[PDB]
Design a binder for this molecule. Structure first.
Ligand SMILES: CC(=O)N[C@H]1[C@H]([C@H](O)[C@H](O)CO)O[C@@](O)(C(=O)O)C[C@@H]1O
Ligand SMILES: *[C@@H]1O[C@H](CO)[C@@H](O)[C@H](O)[C@H]1NC(C)=O
Ligand SMILES: *[C@@H]1O[C@H](CO)[C@@H](O)[C@H](O)[C@H]1NC(C)=O
Ligand SMILES: *[C@@H]1O[C@H](CO)[C@@H](O)[C@H](O)[C@H]1NC(C)=O
Ligand SMILES: *[C@@H]1O[C@H](CO)[C@@H](O)[C@H](O)[C@H]1NC(C)=O
Ligand SMILES: *[C@@H]1O[C@H](CO)[C@@H](O)[C@H](O)[C@H]1NC(C)=O
Ligand SMILES: *[C@@H]1O[C@H](CO)[C@@H](O)[C@H](O)[C@H]1NC(C)=O
Ligand SMILES: OC[C@H]1O[C@@H](O)[C@H](O)[C@@H](O)[C@H]1O
Lengths: 173, 330, 326, 173, 325, 172
């Protein structure tokens, strides 16, 4: 994908993460499960919704075709009407079709960017207190219980707090 | 062995696909179809107003008052007009309705007409009214009749056909739509029989309009058993204008005419055989009612009311969710 | 320890743009591409004044309604302004045939020069001095006629003979000219004004023919007249010749215009002022460098593109997130 | 932000940095301040000015409506002319409005990316010789000169030169 | 000293440039030009079918049967018409061809006509059909001739000009394109000489068409020596329709007419040569033989052509930006 | 560029790498050379090819001009036809020229993105067994064999296998 995360360095999606577009999956002694990152998901929803409503808005005028009859001495203006109406029909078909293809590419990139950013956000809190497995997963060099998991998700993870423990484990292995 | 946290994205059982500039047939978790392709194959009421069904009569047959179109005779109010493709009852006495396309356009404009007697038969002096009838214009009851809105005037038993005059002064607030004609015999014989001898004319005028026509006599190919023709004409007498009719002979005279209410609505004439039913619509196309929220439609370019924009597309699906990559179950 | 930080510009700006994703986003810098302002007046275009028809319509001007004498003669215009309340047009009731086509041809010009096409002496044996009507007063004479036409009538004793006239356009310029056909209300006026019997007006050039005879009938009174005139116009091409022939009911061409040819015709009440413009719309002057305007689709000169938008502001700067100061 | 920097992992802009779009804020024993990166600022100004001129250029045609009259037998061609003029008006209004919404989105992204890439250019240079605070700020583990600040900005930062001082500080703590 | 692996991108000798919204003149490794600006300056066959070259005749000269357009006389099939600008042979006897622009439009949109005798000279009784000739319409071999498709009917040596009548019933499946006229003498002397005395008329009619006209005598400016005029008319007799003709003078009678068979039709007014070539896309200024999507040659064409735009070039980058060392 | 790699932290392109859009340069005891990344190059070609064909396909209708004649009483509809045809001519000229400018900008960013993500793919394999220089280049902390270079390009690079050797020289 262009930011390289979705179907990228993160191979597949989660059917188990049912309450959001982007999320965390966690495992610890306490348990395992899925949680959406609410803030990034709600911002994407607002953005996508604005995009859809903008497009609907801008597309909210209509060319008017008409039922007028023409006589056998009105071939030129009859054809003028015909090429005129077809003319606008072709321009609007083009605009709608090209717009959907283009916006569909950019909408997928946006999602790919939000996943990538969510991953970079976690990565930089954790520093070397965790080990990169591949596939967007980090293995902690220390015990990370539920409160510690939440602080990663919240953006308040305490790297100094677990540094000494992480360093001792990183050595013995 | 150790505690994991992983960053990922949603997937689901969606099989719906979109296209993008770079890739076709991309399955996505969420999307919206912006294009409507469904319709109800029927005509409904627009703004709670029923369309006019012309049934077995064409627009000509209707407003001239073809004798077989009595079902439509009188007042009519409509949101749009529906004319069946194989209506039989139009111009029954052969001839041209001049400026027909522009008449059809003007009638499409209206939301309502009121029929009324414009020139009483008594208006014309020294001529015979009650013989203005033909076999090419039967009603359903009588074999020889004539349009309900025109008098075919004939000279009385005296060889002379006198100059006749008629005036109507539109003291109303509505324009009046009215019709007349000029008869063209296949014969100088028939010409003599029905009208006087010598040069005949039909002249008419208003404060802003002139008309002068004389007969053009010749045998034409038979139609409805007639080798003669009638030139039909239409016009619109503005509020405050006066009409003067003057004729030597060959006048088919205005008898009834219509007060005409122009419409705020765009107006339409649909040529179609679809049913009219007791239903309501917001969007009426010529091939059906669209009952929809969508932005685009592929049903028809021709419509009255509030419709989505017409495009040739088969589908316009916008991705809203992301690329759907669910785990393989096995 | 020592910091180095990466960041971006912020400012006092409270100007916003819209985005497909977001509405009302404040940005540090931006450009409005749309012009919504207008001087409510008419100005010169290309240092050339417009023609103000004043109390006359285009018909009154170009046929020479006697109350339009201020307009008479040569005119050069960058565009025409026709006032919607103008009372002086066709004074003697009747149709100016192909009116809309005439108005469009006049709109495509920038100059006319008036000139006598057919001197009254053209038509032998008829009365060219008696053709006046109460339906066309000047401001001083209660009975006058169009300055560009002669209403010819039979001399004091009958009869109205065949009259003929030719004009050869040896000039480099197309000539716009006019004529008419009188339709008396009754036979009595036909016989008084003209000879007894069938009457015709016939005209032709290398490329055009015309033939018409009187349609005698009483029409509703208009300016006291139950009769009518059918007016006509044409363009005599450079190198073309015009033959005119009639035995009666001819409203003859007298004066005509050498015509010099996208101008415009503005129906408006805006004032014309001693001002100069690059761009003129029907509702005013645009003095602007913007790319789009919502003022009008109808204009002359070099004007930006007309759109229905209220604002077309292009973000150039970044999103504005200035520090909160308490 | 789609690249996540602007109003993102860098929370706010600087009213104090007045001579550029994108910049460095430094603090050291010799003083502190705000200095724009000239090259990335100028490239963006050239780019954005070109976009405005291209749009202005591509919009430099007009459709011209006309004052023509129609008679009472010319309802059909009179209405043909109106629908055509209205049609071209609706098309150009759509093109301008959709273009503005789309290019504003992409313009803000461009700025976001230019900030994100300055931030990465510094982060790769510094490696573990500096500590990532939040908000796009780095704290050096060594003493950073005005001359050293310049070397980070212009791309010639000497990581070997401070690696020992930095390590001893990094974990003398 | 250490081993290295580096990530990087393609570069090449390309000097080809593209424009983007942000930057002009960007050299790029690979690109595709979508616009065609080149043409063969000739006319070619289209659906393996030749065009009609009207040579020295206008469309009017051809279908009326101007005596010097005999080389065109008869049946024709065409993929498009070429009318040469300086073509001299059209309406030879001065007069107006009524509804000309609408006739020209009906003709283009045809693909073929078959000429046939609609009304034999024997159709009209009591009149001379052999004298209807003028010095304004010479052939190449006689000074005084007339349109091949019309008969200028005139009085028998012994007056007068009776009522003449003719009918034709279109029994085929094809529409018939036909012509007639009304003579307008400059004098009552020529009127009396050619036709009788008395009020003359020309009346025609079908199931859906009415025509009536009377002579309009007057001297018009001299053209090809003629101060008289003919008003010319055309019409189309639908399959199943009957035509009735009636006149007591001034009738220029239909003689030959055309079975007319009706895609996109084209009348190219050009002086370009018609050569022995084949093509898929023909414009008024020449052949495009191209796979490109856009063209800057002409908005007027027949066949399958690229879309016309005013652009000078439409080059899509496909490759990346070229930065060689 | 917008992803910062092309004409960015990777200052130049490689005239040497002929067989692909994006790829690898390696130096080692056995030599030095170039190799395209087949997978990302083909995926880009596929994408770009589809974009060009979508654009051609959507531009596949033509407005048809006609050269009907108009008389001297038909100046208005003659003018109507002209404005109508020039009006569609102007819209399609606008549509094509703007699309080309926009799409060109986006295709350059796509290439930039692809190079960037290849750089990050490698970086993530190598971890601290190598040093990331400013320029898209990694200097190994160990001896990297032709086999070793191939495994980096394959995505099968073996980090634990070289961790200890890399730790050592990193300490020297
Ligand atoms: C008023 C009058 O004449 N009516 C008669 C007409 C007309 O004379 C012819 O139609 C003219 O050609 O002919 C018949 C008919 O067609 O039914 C009988 C009818 O009574
Ligand atoms: C989309 O892909 C399907 C197969 O996955 C194919 O049948 C279809 O033709 C493609 N595009 C269309 C027609 O929407
Ligand atoms: C028609 O009626 C109105 C209203 O009385 C009258 O003013 C007008 O004179 C009438 N028309 C004419 C010309 O008599
Ligand atoms: C970059 O920084 C160094 C260190 O301050 C300085 O010596 C050099 O001149 C600067 N390089 C430039 C401006 O190119
Ligand atoms: C570049 O090199 C190729 C390979 O031989 C050659 O065919 C081509 O003409 C050269 N092109 C340019 C732009 O110099
Ligand atoms: C024309 O011919 C057909 C069949 O030959 C005949 O049925 C029809 O009545 C004829 N039409 C006229 C009006 O003569
Ligand atoms: C991949 O790399 C290995 C060395 O790690 C090599 O032996 C093998 O042939 C390569 N295979 C592929 C995927 O081409
Ligand atoms: O009313 C006159 C008519 O009478 C009908 O019977 C006859 O069929 C018609 O041809 C016509 O003559």
């Amino acid at each position: 994908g262009i930011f390289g995360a979705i179907a990228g360095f993160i191979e597949g999606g989660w059917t188990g993460m049912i309450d959001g577009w982007y999320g965390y999956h966690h495992e610890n002694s306490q348990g395992s499960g899925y949680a959406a990152d609410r803030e990034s998901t709600q911002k994407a929803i607002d953005g996508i919704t604005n995009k859809v409503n903008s497009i609907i808005n801008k597309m909210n005028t209509q060319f008017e075709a008409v039922d007028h009859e023409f006589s056998n001495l009105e071939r030129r203006i009859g054809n003028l009407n015909k090429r005129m109406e077809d003319g606008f029909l072709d321009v609007w078909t083009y605009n709608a079709e090209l717009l959907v293809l283009l916006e569909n590419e950019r909408t997928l990139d946006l999602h790919d960017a939000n996943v990538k950013n969510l991953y970079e956000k976690v990565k930089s809190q954790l520093r070397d207190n965790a080990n990169d497995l591949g596939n967007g997963c980090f293995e902690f060099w220390h015990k990370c219980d539920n409160e510690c998991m939440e602080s990663v998700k919240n953006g308040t993870y305490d790297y100094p707090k677990y540094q000494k423990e992480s360093k001792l484990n990183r050595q013995g292995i | 062995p150790g505690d994991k946290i992983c960053i990922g994205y949603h997937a689901n059982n969606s099989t719906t696909q979109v296209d993008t500039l770079l890739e076709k047939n991309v399955t996505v978790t969420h999307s919206v179809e912006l294009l409507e392709n469904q319709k109800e194959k029927r005509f409904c009421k627009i703004m709670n107003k029923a369309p006019l069904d012309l049934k077995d009569c064409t627009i000509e047959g209707w407003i001239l008052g073809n004798p077989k179109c009595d079902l439509l005779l009188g007042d009519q109010s409509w949101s749009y007009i529906v004319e069946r493709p194989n209506a039989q009852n139009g111009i029954c006495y052969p001839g041209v309705l001049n400026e027909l396309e522009e008449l059809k356009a003007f009638i499409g404009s209206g939301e309502r007409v009121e029929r009324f007697e414009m020139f009483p038969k008594s208006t014309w002096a020294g001529v015979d009214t009650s013989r203005g009838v033909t076999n090419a214009c039967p009603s359903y009851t009588i074999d020889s009749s004539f349009y309900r809105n025109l008098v075919w005037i004939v000279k009385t038993d005296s060889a002379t056909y006198p100059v006749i005059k008629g005036t109507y002064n539109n003291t109303g607030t509505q324009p009046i739509l009215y019709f007349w004609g000029v008869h063209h015999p296949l014969d100088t014989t028939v010409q003599d029989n029905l009208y006087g001898s010598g040069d005949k004319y039909v002249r008419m005028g208003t404060e802003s309009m002139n008309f002068a026509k004389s007969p053009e006599i010749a045998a034409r190919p038979a139609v409805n058993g007639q080798r003669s023709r009638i030139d039909y004409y239409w016009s619109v007498l503005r509020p405050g204008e006066t009409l003067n009719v003057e004729s030597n002979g060959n006048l088919i005279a205005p008898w009834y005419a219509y007060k005409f209410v122009s419409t705020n609505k765009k107006g339409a004439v649909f040529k179609s055989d679809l049913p009219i039913e007791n239903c309501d619509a917001t969007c009426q196309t010529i091939t059906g009612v669209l009952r929809t929220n969508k932005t685009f439609q592929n049903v028809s370019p021709l419509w009255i009311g509030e419709c989505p924009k017409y495009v040739k597309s088969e589908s316009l699906r916008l991705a809203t969710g992301l690329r759907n990559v669910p785990q393989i179950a096995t």
